Chains A and B, each alone.
With several copies, the nearest count.
Chain A
Amino acid sequence: AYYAEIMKDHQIENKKKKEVDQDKKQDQSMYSTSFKRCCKIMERMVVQNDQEDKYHDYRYYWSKNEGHLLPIWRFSNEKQRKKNVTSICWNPLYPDLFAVSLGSYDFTKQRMGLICLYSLKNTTHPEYAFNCEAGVMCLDFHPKSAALLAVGLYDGTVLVYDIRNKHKKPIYQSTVRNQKHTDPVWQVKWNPDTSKNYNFYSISSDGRVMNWILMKNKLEPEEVILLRSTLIGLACGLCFDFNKFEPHIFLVGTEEGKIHKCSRAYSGQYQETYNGHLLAVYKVKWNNFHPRTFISASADWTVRIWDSKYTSQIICFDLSMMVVDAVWAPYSSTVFACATMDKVQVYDLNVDKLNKLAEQKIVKQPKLTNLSFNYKDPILLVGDSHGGVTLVKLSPNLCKSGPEIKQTEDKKAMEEFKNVKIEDYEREKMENL
C-alpha cells in the first residue's frame, strides 16, 4: 500500500506490462513471458534432482606423473544420430553455455545439419536449435558479444545467427553475388577487433581465406590470401588460426599437407612454409601464453609441435590410430589433447618428454570427430560420429607453478613463467638435435 502511494507521488517511469495478457478463453490461455521462465526453471530443477549424484561429482570430485579422465554427461538426439559432431565452441561471456554444430563427414553421404547450443544447466535437450540447408562444418562465437554466432556449411555458404533473436532464421547469408567460395567451409573464426564493425574470417577447400564484414542488409567480402608448383588449380585448405599476440600473422593448414604462415598485409606472398607433414592437416592452433609456437593434427597419424622461426617440427607424437584433432589447454601452456579412434590422450611437456599422462575411451560404440577445451574450468568436450557430445573433467595432478606451491608470490608468472618454461623446454630439444 505504502509503495503504491510513493509511485503516485513520484508519476516518473509509470509501470508498464499492461494487462492485455494472452486471453483466448480456452485452447492455450496465457501459458507464455513470466510463466515460461517458471517452466524453464522447473525443468532444470527436476533434472538437477535426478542427476544430483553426477552434479555433486562434476563440481568437486577432485578426480605423481599420472592423469585420470572421467566422462560425466552425454548430450545427443535419436533423430540426429546420422550426423557427425564436427566443430564445437564455448561462449566467451558464459562458461556454462557451449555450442556444438552437427554436420556430415564422408562426402558421398550428405544430409541437413542442426546447430545445438547445450547449456550445462539442462543436459536432456538443447537450449537453442537451428535447422540449416546442409551439414554445418564450422561454428564460432565472437569474443566481445557472444550473441553473434559464426556458421560455415557445404556449398561454402557463410551464415551469421543471433541467439537473442526469437524467430531463429539467419541474420546474414553469403550468395554468389557476395562472392561465396565453392565446395565447403572447414574452419570459420571471428576477428577480436571491433574498430571496423565485425570481422568474420573463413577458409574453404577451394582455398581462399575470406574476410567478411557485417553491414546493414549486405555482406562485403575481401580475399585475404590465396593458398596456391607443377599442379592444377588452387591448393585446398582444411584449417586456419590467428596469433592472439600478433593479429597480422596467421597459420593455415592444407590438404597437400604443408602448413603455411601468412600475413594479412601481403596477399600474394607466403611469410614461411613448413614441409613437415606428409598428408592433410586437420587442425592447426597457436599455443597459449607464448608467440611463434603451435600444434597441428594431420590424417598421417602424427601430432607435431613447431616453432615459427624453425622450418621443420621440434617434437612429433606418433600414435598408431589416426589423429583427428589436437587442441592446446587454455589454463596452462605445454598441455594439449589428441583424439584418435575412440582414444582421447592428454600430454604435459614438464611431466613427461614423450609418454602420455592419461589415455581414456569416453565412448566405445562410435569414433571421435572433434574435441574442444573450456577456458574457465579444467573440462574437455569430446564429439562422437553419432552426434553425441560427452564432456570430461581432467585430474588435478596436472597444473601450473607445480615445482613449489605458492613460491615467490609472482602474479606476472601466470602469463610470463609459462612464456619462459616453453622457451626453457624449447632450448632442451635444440641441444638434443
Chain B
Amino acid sequence: FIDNNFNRFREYSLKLLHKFQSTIKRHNLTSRYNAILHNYATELDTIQRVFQDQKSNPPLVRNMPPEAGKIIWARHLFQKITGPINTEIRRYYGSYNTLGKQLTIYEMWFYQDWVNKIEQSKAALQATLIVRHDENKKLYVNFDLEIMQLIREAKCLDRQGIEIPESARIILLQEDKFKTYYNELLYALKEYERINSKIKPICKNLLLPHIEDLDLKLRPGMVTLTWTSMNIESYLYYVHQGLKKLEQLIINVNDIIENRIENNLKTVSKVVLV
C-alpha cells in the first residue's frame, strides 16, 4: 500500500507528511524519508529538464511583456526549487546547481534590459501629444506601446516584490493620470470622426472653415503640450467645449435639412395637382 502511494506521488510531497504523522507513532521512518526525497528528486529533475528547454522561449503569464515576464518565470521556478530542500547532501548539490544559476543569469538579465529600456521610454514619453499619418490624413494618438509596456512591467515587479529603479517608479506613480488622459483623447477623436460623418456631403465645403476652426483649436494642444504639461486637463476641457459647439451647430443645420426642407421637398414631389 505504501509503494502504490509513493508511485502516485511521483502536491503529493505535502500528502506524504500527513501519512508520516500516523507512522511517526510506531527502518520504516528511513524508507518514508527516502520515498519523500525520491518524490523531491523527480520534481527537481522535471524542473531541471524544463529550465534547459524553456529558458530560450519560455511560456509567460497572460498579457505579460517579454522582459519582466522572462524574469518572473525564472523567479517562479526559484520559488518551486526551494520547497523540496527544507547521501542527503547529493540531493542538495544538484538543486544548488540550479539556484546557483537562475539568480546569476536572470539578474544579469534584469540590469541589461532595464538600463536599456528606461532611456528609450522617457524619450518616447516626451514626444508631442498626437500625430496624424500623412497617408491617413486623419487624427491619431501618439502614445508609443513601449511606455504602457514599461508601466505594466513596473507593476508586475512590485507585485512579486523586486526593488525597481526610482526613475521607472516615478512613471508608475503617475500612471493613474497617463491612462485617464489617453482614454479621454481616444474618446475625443472617435467623437471627432463620428461628428465629421454626421455632416451631409453637400455642406462639407460650406462647413470646412468650422472644421478648420476646431482643428485650429487642437493644433496648440497637439505640438506645444509635449504630453507632460502643467495643465493638460485644462486643454481636454476646451476640446470637449469645442466639439459640443460643433455638435449643436451641425444638429441645427442637419435638423432643418433632414426635417423642415426635405419634408417640404418630398410633399411637393408627391403633390400630384390632378
What residues make up the interface of A, taking CB atoms closer than 8 Å to B?
105-108, 110, 155, 175-177, 180, 182-184, 205-206, 231-233, 236, 238, 255-256, 278-280, 282, 299-300, 302, 316-318, 320, 322, 341, 354-355, 367, 432-433
Does B62 reach chain A (CB closer than 8 Å)? yes
Closest to B9 in A: A354
CB contacts (< 8 Å) of A176 on chain B: these are 183-184, 186-187
Closest to B169 in A: A232
Contact between A316 and B18 (Cβ–Cβ < 8 Å)?
A: no
Contact between A155 and B18 (Cβ–Cβ < 8 Å)?
A: no
Contact between B50 and A105 (Cβ–Cβ < 8 Å)?
A: no
Does B29 reach chain A (CB closer than 8 Å)? no
Complex A-B: 11 CB contacts under 8 Å = A108-B65, A108-B149, A182-B182, A233-B155, A236-B155, A236-B159, A256-B159, A279-B61, A302-B11, A367-B59, A433-B18
Contact between B183 and A182 (Cβ–Cβ < 8 Å)?
A: yes
Query: Contacts A232-B173, A341-B59: A354 and B11 contacting too (C-beta < 8 A)?
Result: yes
Contact between A279 and B76 (Cβ–Cβ < 8 Å)?
A: yes
Contact between B158 and A231 (Cβ–Cβ < 8 Å)?
A: yes
Contact between B11 and A278 (Cβ–Cβ < 8 Å)?
A: no
Closest to A104 in B: B63
Question: Which 3 pairs, one residue from A and one from B, show the smallest C-beta to C-beta distance?
Answer: A318-B11, A182-B179, A107-B63
CB contacts (< 8 Å) of A108 on chain B: these are 65-66, 145, 149
Closest to A105 in B: B62
Cβ of B167 to closest chain A Cβ, rounded Å: 14
Cβ of B41 to closest chain A Cβ, rounded Å: 14
Contact between A316 and B76 (Cβ–Cβ < 8 Å)?
A: no
User: Which of A232, A355, A433 counts the most chain B CB atoms within 10 A?
Assistant: A232
Does B2 reach chain A (CB closer than 8 Å)? no
Closest to B50 in A: A320
Say which residue of B66, B79, B152 sits within 8 Å of A278 (CB atoms): B79
Contact between A105 and B63 (Cβ–Cβ < 8 Å)?
A: yes
CB contacts (< 8 Å) of B66 on chain A: these are 108
User: Which of A180, A282, A302, A433 counts the most chain B CB atoms within 10 A?
Assistant: A433
Cβ of B60 to closest chain A Cβ, rounded Å: 7
Does B172 reach chain A (CB closer than 8 Å)? yes
CB contacts (< 8 Å) of A367 on chain B: these are 59
Contact between B11 and A233 (Cβ–Cβ < 8 Å)?
A: no
Contact between A355 and B8 (Cβ–Cβ < 8 Å)?
A: yes
CB contacts (< 8 Å) of B72 on chain A: these are 279
Say which residue of B64, B65, B155, B183 sits within 8 Å of A180 (CB atoms): B183
Give residues 125-152 of B contacting A (CB, 8 Å). Answer: 145, 149, 152
Does B198 reach chain A (CB closer than 8 Å)? no
CB contacts (< 8 Å) of B187 on chain A: these are 175-177
Say which residue of B76, B156, B158 sits within 8 Å of A232 (CB atoms): B158
CB contacts (< 8 Å) of A316 on chain B: these are 11, 14
Closest to A316 in B: B11
Contact between A320 and B184 (Cβ–Cβ < 8 Å)?
A: no
Does B46 reach chain A (CB closer than 8 Å)? yes
Say which residue of A106, A155, A256, A320 sits within 8 Å of B63 (CB atoms): A106
Query: Contacts A155-B183, A255-B159: A317 and B62 contacting too (C-beta < 8 A)?
Result: no
Does B101 reach chain A (CB closer than 8 Å)? no
Contact between B15 and A354 (Cβ–Cβ < 8 Å)?
A: yes
Closest to B61 in A: A299
Contact between B158 and A354 (Cβ–Cβ < 8 Å)?
A: no
Does B92 reach chain A (CB closer than 8 Å)? no
Say which residue of A183, A280, A317 sits within 8 Å of B11 (CB atoms): A317
Does B30 reach chain A (CB closer than 8 Å)? no
Give residues 17-69 of B contacting A (CB, 8 Å). Answer: 18, 46, 50, 59-66
Contact between B76 and A233 (Cβ–Cβ < 8 Å)?
A: no
Contact between B145 and A232 (Cβ–Cβ < 8 Å)?
A: no
Contact between B12 and A155 (Cβ–Cβ < 8 Å)?
A: no
Contact between B60 and A106 (Cβ–Cβ < 8 Å)?
A: yes
